[PDB]
Amino acid sequence: PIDQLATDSNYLEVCYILLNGEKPTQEQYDEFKTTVTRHTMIHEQITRLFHAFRRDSHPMAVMCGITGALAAFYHDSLDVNNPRHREIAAFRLLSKMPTMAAMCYKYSIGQPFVYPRNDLSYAGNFLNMMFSTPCEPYEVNP
Amino acid sequence: ADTKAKLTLDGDTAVELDVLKGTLGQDVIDIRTLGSKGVFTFDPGFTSTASCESKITFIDGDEGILLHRGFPIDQLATDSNYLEVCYILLNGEKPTQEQYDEFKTTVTRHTMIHEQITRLFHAFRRDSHPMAVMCGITGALAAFYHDSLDVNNPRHREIAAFRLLSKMPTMAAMCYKYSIGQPFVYPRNDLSYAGNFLNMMFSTPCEPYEVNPILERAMDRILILHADHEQNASTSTVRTAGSSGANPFACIAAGIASLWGPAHGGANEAALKMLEEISSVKHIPEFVRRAKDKNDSFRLMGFGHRVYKNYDPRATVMRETCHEVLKELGTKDDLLEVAMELENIALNDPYFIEKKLYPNVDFYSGIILKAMGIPSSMFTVIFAMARTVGWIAHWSEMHSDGMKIARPRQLYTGYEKRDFKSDIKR
Amino acid sequence: ADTKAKLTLDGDTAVELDVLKGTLGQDVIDIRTLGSKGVFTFDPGFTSTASCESKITFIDGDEGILLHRGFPIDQLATDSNYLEVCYILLNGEKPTQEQYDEFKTTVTRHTMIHEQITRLFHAFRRDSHPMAVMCGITGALAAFYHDSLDVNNPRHREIAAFRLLSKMPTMAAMCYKYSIGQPFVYPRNDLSYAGNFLNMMFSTPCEPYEVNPILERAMDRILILHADHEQNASTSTVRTAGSSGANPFACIAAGIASLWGPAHGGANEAALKMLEEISSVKHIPEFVRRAKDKNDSFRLMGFGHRVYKNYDPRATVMRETCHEVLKELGTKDDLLEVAMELENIALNDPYFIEKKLYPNVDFYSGIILKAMGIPSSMFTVIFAMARTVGWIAHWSEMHSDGMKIARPRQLYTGYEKRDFKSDIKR
């Protein structure tokens, strides 16, 4: 039940459930997590693409434009018939979407992009890339 | 208490004029409604015309007195700090601990410059003078922060004011970094105005940077001492541009161009020509250049000033600070002992005593900046950076007065009306 | 010719002041000595003070007179072209063919702007108001043209004047192409000053652009009619900044900002607020917006002008040109028939008739520019671009006079000297 997941789980565990069909074993979750975190960075060349968009553009339009351009970069996982390809493409999306989303916001307001931190949770790391500023370390309210 | 009553003008008949009194200085002959009679005065440069009523800064030239909201400059440079002095200039009184902390909080929260403005920096040439880059960026601020340009809107004015006060330092330091090929440094909310500035100037990713307390304090006094200087040409430019309704940023950008005017207004070798004759006649370790250079004297190099008669009241603390700084940066300034000799020359050489070319605040400020490792092209940028709060103060005062638009007259001496017949075909 | 000799000022002792006479306009009282004699007038706004002697432009507001070097604006507008007017304003005399060819060739020789400057444009947001980009670019010029900044060197002023004169229409057109996302167009040597601007504004690489002779003359006229308008606010700013040493490029940029001041100084809805109430009360095809808008009247929309009592002399030829243009661009302006109704309203409404809100030169300029497809965001850019010559001439005249530095007085009404005791501890 959704109420049970929103109350007692977390986003990645729920991502694991949706993608795998069962709640994860502690070993399965930790492995899943490790992988998701190791690939949260977006290729530096994709960042340049962000600068070709107008600053007044809607973040959602920028979000679409960047996602639809991912195939021109990560061209090593496009064969949908190849399970290895599908898993890799899957993981790249799951890991990178947050980084992408936060950059749209930062770009929209004129603030510098913030790199993901492997020490923070999915939700905390997202709030960090949304609100952190070089001016001082940012602390996410629990 | 003499002619504090009235005065009269006579061309063939009489006209009575009020004579407003000041709290300090000279009283003035009110001529506001004269124009409504056709009678105009003539005064290029306005040196016999009070262009406004002000309460910000008071100067008595011959007495060597400089006051800011009544507070003697020596007292502010010694016991205050730049932001508190900014608060005084902008608000009229020293702040309550609660008022200062609020002011500070606001200034720090808006020190970052929009990321798109940073790109603008890269379109400039690397060899460009930081001062020219500083003007170009300030004058472009209106194309970004387009949400605070209505000078008639007090909320707009306060916001524009704060954005300038907070961002000028970040801007100044980026000009330097860009000029030398080093990466821009983001402001740190944990550091003081002066410390945070020195950090964005000298910090490198290669390692954390630590600001010397003596250097920090020295820079703070350099800023304090340049915070304001009354109705000079550059401030009057800010006031005049603002009277027409030019946006806040455009006004600050003009005061900057106006502030370095003398630096390039002087020949490509004004005070520079002899800075090249230090190679063929360097047989004498001093009178070779910066001691035989000034044919056409300059207050730009730290000697003399049209405002004060005998001494610059600002130079007192700067000279003492100057001793402290050199006496700290150790063996790296001993070579810069010529300063003691230029001062010696300015005090004892008959040429300087004659012209009254006393070392002004920029002479010592100059020594302190050179001691800290700052290129001379960054001196007026720093002075302009410091001067911006005063410019904001006069501009804001002008706007509370009712923005009396500068609409002067002219003595027309050209052609009477004559018909036009063209003799070309192109 | 009654007392064009002398007059007296009485405060405590009678001071003898010479009366100076013009060739047209009112006489002035020379008070450049009162200052030293310890006497200061008080004129915020300079309405009873002549800031200079000038031979460029003469205005007689009440009798609708406007002369540039003695020539009536009507004649120049109908019998000259923008470039010859430029020559006249700058040199004081109409040019011979030879002088004109040489002048036109010099201008043509410097129309292109450095390609690096072209890289500054791309750092501005595409959504930037074209005027903010203009102040931005013009204020960045000094960093690129650093060899023509010696305001005290006559060769530099000349170089600068031709640089500003030659490149403004290039930059102005780039501001437009940039804002609409079309490629920049290079200056064309074979086109007129006006034909070149139209081509730089509207041509694309997809088809040959045909310069309409009618619109070309109409543009030329808008330009001539905006060449100079005496000592107004923005020209006071140019002269003031200039007298303080500021480089020529910075001076024009300050003028540009001072000129569009009224447009944003308004309120984000000054003359805009009612430009939005044309959706709920549009039951009446006119008095809905631009006929019920002006609560706070504006000469910016083309109605009234502080300078002219009954009418704007520049509007005569502009109105005629307006007829020609609409009567040419055929079925594309018929909708812009409201113009006839706004004029009708300005001429016959008791309110307008009372407060003399006659249609001025920009009322007709706007209709033409609107009819030309040019967006309103560009109107002030084109006016400033044209006014640049008037700014150059005045700035140059200020520099031939001896650059009398703007150093006005103030009536100080602030605190008396007081001691500072830090109220804070942080």
Side-chain angles (χ1 to χ4, degrees):
Chain A
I2 185 62
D3 280 8
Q4 279 182 43
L5 292 176
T7 293
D8 310 310
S9 185
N10 67 215
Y11 189 67
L12 281 187
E13 177 174 36
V14 164
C15 289
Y16 185 95
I17 292 168
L18 287 167
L19 296 172
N20 297 300
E22 315 284 350
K23 53 184 180 180
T25 286
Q26 180 63 273
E27 71 164 21
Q28 296 179 309
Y29 171 89
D30 291 333
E31 176 202 354
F32 188 68
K33 183 186 181 180
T34 296
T35 299
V36 170
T37 71
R38 288 184 304 144
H39 306 277
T40 52
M41 289 172 91
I42 58 91
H43 189 118
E44 159 181 47
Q45 191 58 45
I46 295 168
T47 295
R48 304 326 226 206
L49 187 52
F50 274 88
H51 292 288
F53 278 91
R54 305 165 55 107
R55 288 274 182 184
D56 65 12
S57 299
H58 184 140
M60 198 72 176
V62 173
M63 192 66 174
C64 287
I66 297 291
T67 300
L70 298 179
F73 293 79
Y74 300 116
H75 65 67
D76 54 338
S77 61
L78 309 181
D79 319 349
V80 299
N81 299 123
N82 177 176
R84 176 189 67 210
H85 273 36
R86 292 197 276 94
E87 177 158 46
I88 291 173
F91 270 99
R92 282 167 165 171
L93 282 155
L94 200 65
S95 305
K96 304 176 195 298
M97 293 299 97
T99 314
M100 189 181 297
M103 288 166 77
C104 289
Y105 172 59
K106 290 300 198 190
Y107 189 77
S108 74
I109 65 165
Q111 286 193 358
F113 302 157
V114 177
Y115 287 99
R117 291 246 301 272
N118 308 337
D119 57 297
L120 302 182
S121 62
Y122 188 100
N125 170 94
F126 174 64
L127 287 180
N128 189 60
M129 295 182 296
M130 279 292 277
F131 306 120
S132 174
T133 284
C135 299
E136 47 157 49
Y138 182 83
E139 273 165 283
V140 181
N141 190 315
Chain B
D2 185 298
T3 181
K4 304 296 190 65
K6 59 185 177 183
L7 64 112
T8 64
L9 179 67
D10 288 347
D12 295 299
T13 315
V15 181
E16 297 177 303
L17 306 160
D18 292 348
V19 47
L20 317 319
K21 300 185 297 297
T23 51
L24 281 169
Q26 300 289 184
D27 291 2
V28 290
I29 298 178
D30 189 0
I31 65 174
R32 283 178 287 186
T33 64
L34 263 196
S36 70
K37 294 171 183 55
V39 51
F40 301 160
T41 61
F42 183 67
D43 194 17
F46 304 130
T47 40
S48 303
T49 309
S51 65
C52 69
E53 169 182 357
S54 182
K55 304 175 185 299
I56 304 176
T57 294
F58 172 76
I59 291 179
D60 181 324
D62 296 334
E63 273 299 89
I65 294 304
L66 173 61
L67 307 179
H68 285 320
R69 295 298 188 181
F71 301 127
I73 185 62
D74 280 8
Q75 279 182 43
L76 292 176
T78 293
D79 310 310
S80 185
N81 67 215
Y82 189 67
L83 281 187
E84 177 174 36
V85 164
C86 289
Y87 185 95
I88 292 168
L89 287 167
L90 296 172
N91 297 300
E93 315 285 350
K94 53 184 180 180
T96 286
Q97 180 63 273
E98 71 164 21
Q99 296 179 309
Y100 171 89
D101 291 333
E102 176 202 354
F103 188 68
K104 183 186 181 180
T105 296
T106 299
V107 170
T108 71
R109 288 184 304 144
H110 306 277
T111 52
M112 289 172 91
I113 58 91
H114 189 118
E115 159 181 47
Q116 191 58 45
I117 295 168
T118 295
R119 304 326 226 206
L120 187 52
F121 274 88
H122 292 288
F124 278 91
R125 305 165 55 107
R126 288 274 182 184
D127 65 12
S128 299
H129 184 140
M131 198 72 176
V133 173
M134 192 66 174
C135 287
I137 297 291
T138 300
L141 298 179
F144 293 79
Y145 300 116
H146 65 67
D147 54 338
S148 61
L149 309 181
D150 319 349
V151 299
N152 299 123
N153 177 176
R155 176 189 67 210
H156 273 36
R157 292 197 276 94
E158 178 158 46
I159 291 173
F162 270 99
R163 282 167 165 171
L164 282 155
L165 200 65
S166 305
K167 304 176 195 298
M168 293 299 97
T170 314
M171 189 181 297
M174 288 166 77
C175 289
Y176 172 59
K177 290 300 198 190
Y178 189 77
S179 74
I180 65 165
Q182 286 193 358
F184 302 157
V185 177
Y186 287 99
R188 291 246 301 272
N189 308 337
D190 57 297
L191 302 182
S192 62
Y193 188 100
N196 170 94
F197 174 64
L198 287 180
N199 189 60
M200 295 182 296
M201 279 292 277
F202 306 120
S203 174
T204 284
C206 299
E207 47 157 49
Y209 182 83
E210 273 165 283
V211 181
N212 190 315
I214 296 173
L215 302 189
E216 202 234 66
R217 191 222 323 188
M219 175 55 76
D220 191 77
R221 295 186 176 186
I222 285 184
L223 273 35
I224 291 167
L225 302 176
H226 286 84
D228 196 59
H229 201 197
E230 213 213 63
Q231 317 295 157
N232 62 182
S234 52
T235 284
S236 294
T237 292
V238 167
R239 281 179 171 276
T240 296
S243 71
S244 78
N247 77 75
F249 313 100
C251 292
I252 294 305
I256 298 179
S258 167
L259 191 78
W260 80 312
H264 59 66
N268 41 294
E269 62 179 61
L272 312 66
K273 181 181 69 293
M274 300 289 273
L275 311 186
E276 177 84 0
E277 184 182 355
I278 206 289
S279 56
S280 60
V281 303
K282 58 79 179 61
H283 195 301
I284 184 287
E286 183 52 296
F287 273 116
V288 48
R289 174 196 179 189
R290 192 169 294 185
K292 179 182 177 181
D293 180 307
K294 72 188 304 88
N295 194 52
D296 184 301
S297 293
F298 301 121
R299 83 107 175 287
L300 201 169
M301 294 184 271
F303 302 106
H305 197 128
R306 73 84 177 181
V307 177
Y308 305 108
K309 183 176 184 174
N310 295 304
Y311 53 103
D312 187 325
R314 295 174 301 176
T316 301
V317 164
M318 206 78 290
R319 179 172 200 282
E320 296 177 356
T321 300
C322 205
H323 183 86
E324 310 175 8
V325 170
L326 279 45
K327 179 178 180 170
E328 173 63 6
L329 292 180
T331 306
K332 184 69 65 180
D333 181 289
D334 302 304
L335 60 164
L336 202 59
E337 169 185 58
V338 308
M340 202 177 265
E341 175 61 21
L342 290 166
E343 181 184 60
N344 186 57
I345 290 185
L347 268 47
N348 300 304
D349 185 299
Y351 180 80
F352 292 67
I353 292 175
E354 198 283 82
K355 277 62 177 60
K356 305 300 295 284
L357 302 173
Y358 51 72
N360 61 43
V361 69
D362 298 338
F363 175 73
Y364 302 98
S365 288
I367 299 169
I368 294 173
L369 289 175
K370 286 176 181 176
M372 303 175 99
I374 293 171
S376 50
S377 54
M378 275 295 290
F379 298 173
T380 304
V381 173
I382 294 163
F383 300 164
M385 173 190 74
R387 184 55 57 72
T388 300
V389 60
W391 286 332
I392 293 168
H394 286 270
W395 175 80
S396 297
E397 201 181 34
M398 186 277 297
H399 271 128
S400 71
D401 278 355
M403 195 182 103
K404 75 303 163 296
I405 315 175
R407 293 177 173 172
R409 307 290 171 165
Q410 56 164 29
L411 164 56
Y412 180 79
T413 64
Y415 278 107
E416 286 86 0
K417 180 275 182 170
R418 50 170 180 162
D419 278 351
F420 172 80
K421 162 51 188 175
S422 179
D423 298 349
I424 75 169
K425 211 305 79 63
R426 190 183 181 185
Chain C
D2 183 301
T3 185
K4 282 184 170 62
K6 57 189 176 183
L7 62 76
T8 58
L9 177 64
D10 161 58
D12 180 63
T13 59
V15 181
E16 174 90 301
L17 298 170
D18 295 342
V19 181
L20 306 178
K21 61 287 92 178
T23 52
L24 299 180
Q26 279 61 289
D27 295 352
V28 302
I29 303 176
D30 188 342
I31 69 173
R32 296 120 86 196
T33 58
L34 290 186
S36 61
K37 289 185 179 60
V39 182
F40 299 161
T41 59
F42 179 81
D43 195 19
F46 303 129
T47 296
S48 299
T49 310
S51 63
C52 66
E53 165 190 351
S54 190
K55 299 169 177 287
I56 307 170
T57 292
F58 172 80
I59 300 182
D60 188 338
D62 299 341
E63 274 69 66
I65 308 290
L66 176 63
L67 312 172
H68 292 323
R69 300 299 185 178
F71 302 124
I73 184 61
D74 267 286
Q75 301 189 38
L76 296 177
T78 65
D79 290 356
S80 198
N81 60 307
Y82 189 64
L83 195 70
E84 177 175 49
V85 173
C86 280
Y87 183 91
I88 295 171
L89 283 170
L90 294 176
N91 297 75
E93 299 290 355
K94 60 171 189 175
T96 52
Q97 187 71 57
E98 189 155 307
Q99 283 171 164
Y100 181 71
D101 295 343
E102 186 184 72
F103 182 70
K104 184 176 194 176
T105 294
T106 300
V107 176
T108 305
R109 187 183 58 156
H110 302 300
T111 52
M112 215 188 304
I113 84 171
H114 192 271
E115 292 286 296
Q116 181 66 50
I117 298 177
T118 296
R119 191 140 120 75
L120 293 174
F121 274 92
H122 303 294
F124 283 85
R125 297 175 51 144
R126 309 300 309 216
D127 67 300
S128 298
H129 184 96
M131 185 67 139
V133 181
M134 170 138 276
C135 292
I137 298 296
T138 306
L141 291 181
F144 301 82
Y145 296 104
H146 49 71
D147 51 336
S148 60
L149 305 178
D150 186 332
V151 301
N152 197 267
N153 184 157
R155 287 115 59 173
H156 278 41
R157 294 191 209 110
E158 171 194 54
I159 289 178
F162 271 122
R163 274 180 171 172
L164 279 165
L165 196 53
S166 301
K167 312 171 191 302
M168 270 300 176
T170 306
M171 301 180 286
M174 287 168 74
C175 283
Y176 177 60
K177 289 298 195 182
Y178 189 70
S179 72
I180 65 165
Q182 289 183 180
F184 294 141
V185 182
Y186 281 93
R188 284 278 298 292
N189 289 32
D190 60 302
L191 297 183
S192 63
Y193 178 106
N196 182 53
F197 180 61
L198 281 167
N199 188 261
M200 288 189 304
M201 279 288 283
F202 300 111
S203 73
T204 78
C206 305
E207 63 157 52
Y209 170 93
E210 291 76 15
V211 181
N212 190 167
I214 301 311
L215 301 187
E216 172 173 355
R217 189 201 286 184
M219 179 55 79
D220 192 28
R221 295 175 175 179
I222 296 181
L223 301 172
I224 293 177
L225 291 162
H226 286 93
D228 188 67
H229 200 219
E230 206 224 57
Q231 316 295 157
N232 65 182
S234 58
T235 294
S236 297
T237 298
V238 169
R239 278 176 180 270
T240 295
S243 75
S244 72
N247 73 75
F249 307 125
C251 294
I252 273 55
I256 300 174
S258 176
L259 201 70
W260 84 308
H264 58 66
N268 42 295
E269 60 180 63
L272 310 67
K273 182 180 69 294
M274 300 289 273
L275 301 187
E276 175 265 359
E277 183 182 355
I278 207 288
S279 56
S280 61
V281 303
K282 58 79 179 61
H283 195 301
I284 185 287
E286 181 53 296
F287 273 116
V288 68
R289 175 194 183 188
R290 190 170 293 185
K292 182 183 191 185
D293 180 306
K294 72 189 304 86
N295 194 51
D296 186 299
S297 290
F298 301 119
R299 83 104 176 290
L300 200 169
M301 288 186 270
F303 300 105
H305 194 125
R306 66 103 186 173
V307 163
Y308 302 110
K309 187 183 182 305
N310 306 307
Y311 67 92
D312 183 358
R314 299 167 298 175
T316 302
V317 177
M318 193 83 296
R319 182 173 195 281
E320 297 179 352
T321 298
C322 193
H323 185 260
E324 310 178 9
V325 170
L326 279 44
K327 178 169 167 183
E328 173 62 7
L329 293 181
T331 307
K332 184 67 65 179
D333 182 289
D334 300 304
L335 60 164
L336 203 58
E337 170 184 57
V338 304
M340 204 173 253
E341 175 61 24
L342 287 171
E343 181 183 62
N344 184 58
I345 291 186
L347 303 175
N348 305 286
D349 183 287
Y351 185 69
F352 291 65
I353 298 174
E354 178 66 6
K355 303 195 167 190
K356 297 174 189 294
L357 298 313
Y358 56 77
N360 59 41
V361 71
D362 296 332
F363 174 72
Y364 307 97
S365 291
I367 298 172
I368 294 176
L369 296 176
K370 273 160 189 172
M372 285 179 181
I374 297 177
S376 303
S377 61
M378 283 300 292
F379 295 177
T380 324
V381 170
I382 284 165
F383 297 162
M385 179 193 90
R387 184 59 53 69
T388 294
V389 60
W391 289 331
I392 297 179
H394 280 269
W395 173 80
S396 296
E397 199 179 40
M398 181 275 296
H399 270 136
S400 68
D401 280 356
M403 195 181 101
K404 75 303 163 294
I405 317 174
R407 294 174 172 170
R409 304 294 169 163
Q410 53 162 34
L411 181 280
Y412 183 80
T413 303
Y415 276 104
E416 300 75 5
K417 179 279 180 177
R418 54 180 185 171
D419 297 307
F420 172 75
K421 171 71 177 63
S422 198
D423 196 313
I424 75 169
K425 196 160 293 295
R426 182 170 172 180

